[PDB]
Amino acid sequence: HHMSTNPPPPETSNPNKPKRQTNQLQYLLRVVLKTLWKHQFAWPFQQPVDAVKLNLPDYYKIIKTPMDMGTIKKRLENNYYWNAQECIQDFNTMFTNCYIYNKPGDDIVLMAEALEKLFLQKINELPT
Ligand SMILES: COc1cc2c(c(OC)c1OC)-c1ccc(OC)c(=O)cc1[C@@H](NC(C)=O)CC2
Ligand code: NA
């Protein structure tokens, strides 16, 4: 009777949202996102959590601000962001969602931690 569904994905396109192309946002796409996207642990993070497919009916009860690298990649390619901080916040939301939903010893958490370490190493060099 009652089907579980996924929420609409986060907005990747809004012509009326203020947006800029900055050196920092270019670095976030060409260096930061590119590095994490190709990482051996990227696969769970390359698209919204599909709670229907993965049989996680509780995921979107716990995680109220979903984020993932597929969304971030589209945002960067679509010039969705006003500043680097908005994009950094999306990465932080993605990692934090994983830590919140799962338990500290879990494989998925180990994966997120490795991606986060690389992320922090790259944003240490954010230009400007
Ligand atoms: C049945 O197979 C899978 C099922 C899930 C996940 C997953 O990717 C590792 C799977 O492998 C395809 C899974 C995926 C993504 C998550 O966040 C990105 C998450 O928090 C959490 C998960 C999963 N939880 C854990 C502790 O790995 C639950 C659902
Ligand atoms: Na947790």
Side-chain angles (χ1 to χ4, degrees), residues 5 7 18 21-22 25 30 48 51 57 63 68 75 82 85 107 110-111 117-118 127-128:
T5 55
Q21 191 59 88
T22 67
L25 284 162
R30 189 195 66 79
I63 297 300
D68 67 275
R75 285 176 172 196
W82 175 258
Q85 172 62 10
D107 277 343
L110 203 163
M111 295 170 86
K117 180 178 191 304
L118 264 192
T128 277

mmCIF file of all heavy atoms in Angstrom, residues 3 5 7 18 21-22 25 30 48 51 57 63 68 75 82 85 107 110-111 117-118 127-128, unseen atoms left out:
data_model
loop_
_atom_site.group_PDB
_atom_site.id
_atom_site.type_symbol
_atom_site.label_atom_id
_atom_site.label_comp_id
_atom_site.label_asym_id
_atom_site.label_seq_id
_atom_site.Cartn_x
_atom_site.Cartn_y
_atom_site.Cartn_z
ATOM 1 N N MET A 3 4.272 3.050 -0.283
ATOM 2 C CA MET A 3 5.606 2.847 -0.823
ATOM 3 C C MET A 3 6.592 3.828 -0.200
ATOM 4 O O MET A 3 6.286 5.012 -0.023
ATOM 5 C CB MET A 3 5.596 3.026 -2.343
ATOM 6 N N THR A 5 9.817 6.101 -0.683
ATOM 7 C CA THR A 5 10.321 6.855 -1.824
ATOM 8 C C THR A 5 11.540 7.649 -1.393
ATOM 9 O O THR A 5 11.792 7.844 -0.204
ATOM 10 C CB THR A 5 9.287 7.839 -2.393
ATOM 11 O OG1 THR A 5 8.817 8.701 -1.348
ATOM 12 C CG2 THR A 5 8.106 7.103 -3.024
ATOM 13 N N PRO A 7 13.451 11.350 -1.381
ATOM 14 C CA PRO A 7 13.098 12.758 -1.497
ATOM 15 C C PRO A 7 13.615 13.299 -2.814
ATOM 16 O O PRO A 7 14.509 12.703 -3.432
ATOM 17 C CB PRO A 7 13.841 13.398 -0.313
ATOM 18 C CG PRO A 7 15.045 12.531 -0.137
ATOM 19 C CD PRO A 7 14.571 11.142 -0.445
ATOM 20 N N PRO A 18 22.018 33.932 -6.727
ATOM 21 C CA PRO A 18 23.291 34.627 -6.979
ATOM 22 C C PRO A 18 24.428 33.624 -7.124
ATOM 23 O O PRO A 18 24.556 32.684 -6.338
ATOM 24 C CB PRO A 18 23.470 35.515 -5.740
ATOM 25 C CG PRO A 18 22.483 35.025 -4.734
ATOM 26 C CD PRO A 18 21.361 34.389 -5.492
ATOM 27 N N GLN A 21 31.753 32.875 -10.701
ATOM 28 C CA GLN A 21 32.897 32.037 -11.016
ATOM 29 C C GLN A 21 34.103 32.697 -10.364
ATOM 30 O O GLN A 21 34.502 33.801 -10.751
ATOM 31 C CB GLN A 21 33.085 31.902 -12.525
ATOM 32 C CG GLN A 21 34.099 30.838 -12.918
ATOM 33 C CD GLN A 21 33.718 29.456 -12.412
ATOM 34 O OE1 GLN A 21 32.988 28.718 -13.075
ATOM 35 N NE2 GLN A 21 34.208 29.102 -11.227
ATOM 36 N N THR A 22 34.655 32.041 -9.351
ATOM 37 C CA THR A 22 35.826 32.537 -8.651
ATOM 38 C C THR A 22 36.959 31.539 -8.806
ATOM 39 O O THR A 22 36.738 30.361 -9.106
ATOM 40 C CB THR A 22 35.546 32.749 -7.156
ATOM 41 O OG1 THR A 22 35.308 31.485 -6.523
ATOM 42 C CG2 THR A 22 34.335 33.649 -6.961
ATOM 43 N N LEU A 25 36.309 28.644 -6.543
ATOM 44 C CA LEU A 25 35.346 27.670 -7.043
ATOM 45 C C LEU A 25 35.915 26.850 -8.195
ATOM 46 O O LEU A 25 35.604 25.657 -8.312
ATOM 47 C CB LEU A 25 34.025 28.350 -7.411
ATOM 48 C CG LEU A 25 33.171 28.714 -6.195
ATOM 49 C CD1 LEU A 25 32.112 29.757 -6.574
ATOM 50 C CD2 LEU A 25 32.498 27.476 -5.614
ATOM 51 N N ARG A 30 38.232 21.668 -10.208
ATOM 52 C CA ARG A 30 39.319 21.047 -10.964
ATOM 53 C C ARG A 30 40.277 20.266 -10.077
ATOM 54 O O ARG A 30 40.924 19.326 -10.552
ATOM 55 C CB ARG A 30 40.104 22.092 -11.762
ATOM 56 C CG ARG A 30 41.102 21.462 -12.734
ATOM 57 C CD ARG A 30 42.130 22.449 -13.270
ATOM 58 N NE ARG A 30 43.034 22.947 -12.236
ATOM 59 C CZ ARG A 30 44.074 22.272 -11.754
ATOM 60 N NH1 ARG A 30 44.347 21.051 -12.202
ATOM 61 N NH2 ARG A 30 44.839 22.818 -10.816
ATOM 62 N N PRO A 48 22.957 10.802 -4.708
ATOM 63 C CA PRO A 48 22.155 10.805 -3.482
ATOM 64 C C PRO A 48 21.983 9.389 -2.959
ATOM 65 O O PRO A 48 21.910 8.430 -3.728
ATOM 66 C CB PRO A 48 20.809 11.374 -3.945
ATOM 67 C CG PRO A 48 21.181 12.286 -5.087
ATOM 68 C CD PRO A 48 22.339 11.613 -5.776
ATOM 69 N N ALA A 51 17.482 5.448 -0.879
ATOM 70 C CA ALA A 51 17.008 4.718 0.282
ATOM 71 C C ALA A 51 16.061 3.620 -0.143
ATOM 72 O O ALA A 51 15.932 2.606 0.554
ATOM 73 C CB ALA A 51 16.325 5.671 1.264
ATOM 74 N N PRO A 57 14.749 2.613 4.874
ATOM 75 C CA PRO A 57 13.564 3.454 5.078
ATOM 76 C C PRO A 57 13.752 4.516 6.146
ATOM 77 O O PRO A 57 12.996 5.496 6.161
ATOM 78 C CB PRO A 57 12.468 2.443 5.445
ATOM 79 C CG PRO A 57 13.199 1.278 5.989
ATOM 80 C CD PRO A 57 14.498 1.208 5.240
ATOM 81 N N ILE A 63 18.464 11.935 8.351
ATOM 82 C CA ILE A 63 19.272 12.896 7.609
ATOM 83 C C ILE A 63 18.310 13.859 6.925
ATOM 84 O O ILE A 63 17.637 13.496 5.948
ATOM 85 C CB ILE A 63 20.174 12.179 6.598
ATOM 86 C CG1 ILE A 63 21.159 11.257 7.334
ATOM 87 C CG2 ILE A 63 20.902 13.185 5.699
ATOM 88 C CD1 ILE A 63 22.092 11.998 8.311
ATOM 89 N N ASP A 68 25.622 15.015 -1.451
ATOM 90 C CA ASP A 68 26.435 13.992 -2.096
ATOM 91 C C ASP A 68 27.281 14.661 -3.172
ATOM 92 O O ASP A 68 27.011 15.796 -3.577
ATOM 93 C CB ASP A 68 25.540 12.927 -2.724
ATOM 94 C CG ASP A 68 24.740 13.482 -3.875
ATOM 95 O OD1 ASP A 68 23.658 14.066 -3.606
ATOM 96 O OD2 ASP A 68 25.208 13.366 -5.026
ATOM 97 N N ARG A 75 26.386 21.108 -9.168
ATOM 98 C CA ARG A 75 26.396 22.505 -8.729
ATOM 99 C C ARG A 75 27.610 23.253 -9.273
ATOM 100 O O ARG A 75 27.484 24.374 -9.793
ATOM 101 C CB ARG A 75 26.326 22.597 -7.202
ATOM 102 C CG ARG A 75 24.923 22.296 -6.647
ATOM 103 C CD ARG A 75 24.850 22.294 -5.116
ATOM 104 N NE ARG A 75 23.457 22.199 -4.682
ATOM 105 C CZ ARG A 75 22.998 22.460 -3.460
ATOM 106 N NH1 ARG A 75 23.814 22.801 -2.468
ATOM 107 N NH2 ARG A 75 21.685 22.362 -3.231
ATOM 108 N N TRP A 82 27.683 30.869 -5.075
ATOM 109 C CA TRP A 82 28.172 32.234 -4.916
ATOM 110 C C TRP A 82 29.636 32.258 -4.481
ATOM 111 O O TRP A 82 30.403 33.106 -4.941
ATOM 112 C CB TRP A 82 27.305 32.974 -3.894
ATOM 113 C CG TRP A 82 27.798 34.344 -3.580
ATOM 114 C CD1 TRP A 82 28.496 34.738 -2.472
ATOM 115 C CD2 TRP A 82 27.642 35.508 -4.388
ATOM 116 N NE1 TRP A 82 28.780 36.077 -2.542
ATOM 117 C CE2 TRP A 82 28.268 36.577 -3.711
ATOM 118 C CE3 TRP A 82 27.031 35.755 -5.622
ATOM 119 C CZ2 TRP A 82 28.291 37.868 -4.224
ATOM 120 C CZ3 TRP A 82 27.059 37.026 -6.126
ATOM 121 C CH2 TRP A 82 27.689 38.073 -5.432
ATOM 122 N N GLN A 85 32.810 28.935 0.107
ATOM 123 C CA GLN A 85 32.260 28.505 1.389
ATOM 124 C C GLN A 85 30.979 27.696 1.210
ATOM 125 O O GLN A 85 30.781 26.678 1.882
ATOM 126 C CB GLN A 85 32.035 29.708 2.308
ATOM 127 C CG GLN A 85 31.290 29.391 3.605
ATOM 128 C CD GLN A 85 32.021 28.406 4.512
ATOM 129 O OE1 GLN A 85 33.187 28.076 4.289
ATOM 130 N NE2 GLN A 85 31.332 27.937 5.549
ATOM 131 N N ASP A 107 32.561 0.471 7.912
ATOM 132 C CA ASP A 107 33.310 0.638 6.663
ATOM 133 C C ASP A 107 32.985 1.961 5.968
ATOM 134 O O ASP A 107 33.886 2.659 5.484
ATOM 135 C CB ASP A 107 32.989 -0.513 5.709
ATOM 136 C CG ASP A 107 33.802 -1.765 5.993
ATOM 137 O OD1 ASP A 107 34.827 -1.672 6.699
ATOM 138 O OD2 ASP A 107 33.421 -2.838 5.481
ATOM 139 N N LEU A 110 34.808 4.726 7.606
ATOM 140 C CA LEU A 110 36.210 4.698 7.198
ATOM 141 C C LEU A 110 36.373 5.322 5.815
ATOM 142 O O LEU A 110 37.311 6.095 5.574
ATOM 143 C CB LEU A 110 36.702 3.245 7.212
ATOM 144 C CG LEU A 110 38.183 2.903 7.342
ATOM 145 C CD1 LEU A 110 38.319 1.438 7.743
ATOM 146 C CD2 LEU A 110 38.937 3.174 6.047
ATOM 147 N N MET A 111 35.444 5.027 4.903
ATOM 148 C CA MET A 111 35.514 5.580 3.553
ATOM 149 C C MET A 111 35.367 7.094 3.570
ATOM 150 O O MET A 111 36.170 7.809 2.962
ATOM 151 C CB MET A 111 34.435 4.945 2.674
ATOM 152 C CG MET A 111 34.652 3.460 2.473
ATOM 153 S SD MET A 111 33.228 2.682 1.682
ATOM 154 C CE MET A 111 33.628 2.980 -0.035
ATOM 155 N N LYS A 117 39.879 13.420 4.719
ATOM 156 C CA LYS A 117 41.293 13.745 4.888
ATOM 157 C C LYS A 117 41.858 14.358 3.615
ATOM 158 O O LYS A 117 42.566 15.374 3.663
ATOM 159 C CB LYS A 117 42.075 12.486 5.252
ATOM 160 C CG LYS A 117 43.572 12.708 5.464
ATOM 161 C CD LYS A 117 44.245 11.404 5.876
ATOM 162 C CE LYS A 117 45.668 11.636 6.349
ATOM 163 N NZ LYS A 117 46.481 12.339 5.322
ATOM 164 N N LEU A 118 41.552 13.750 2.462
ATOM 165 C CA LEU A 118 42.001 14.288 1.182
ATOM 166 C C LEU A 118 41.398 15.660 0.923
ATOM 167 O O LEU A 118 42.084 16.570 0.445
ATOM 168 C CB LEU A 118 41.599 13.344 0.050
ATOM 169 C CG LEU A 118 42.571 12.311 -0.493
ATOM 170 C CD1 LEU A 118 41.984 11.740 -1.780
ATOM 171 C CD2 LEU A 118 43.941 12.933 -0.737
ATOM 172 N N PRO A 127 43.053 28.734 -3.293
ATOM 173 C CA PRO A 127 43.728 29.969 -3.724
ATOM 174 C C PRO A 127 43.129 31.237 -3.138
ATOM 175 O O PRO A 127 42.153 31.188 -2.377
ATOM 176 C CB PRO A 127 43.573 29.941 -5.250
ATOM 177 C CG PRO A 127 42.364 29.076 -5.490
ATOM 178 C CD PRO A 127 42.411 28.030 -4.416
ATOM 179 N N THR A 128 43.715 32.375 -3.513
ATOM 180 C CA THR A 128 43.346 33.696 -3.000
ATOM 181 C C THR A 128 43.590 33.798 -1.500
ATOM 182 O O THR A 128 44.739 33.858 -1.058
ATOM 183 C CB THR A 128 41.889 34.095 -3.350
ATOM 184 O OG1 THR A 128 41.844 34.639 -4.676
ATOM 185 C CG2 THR A 128 41.358 35.124 -2.361
#
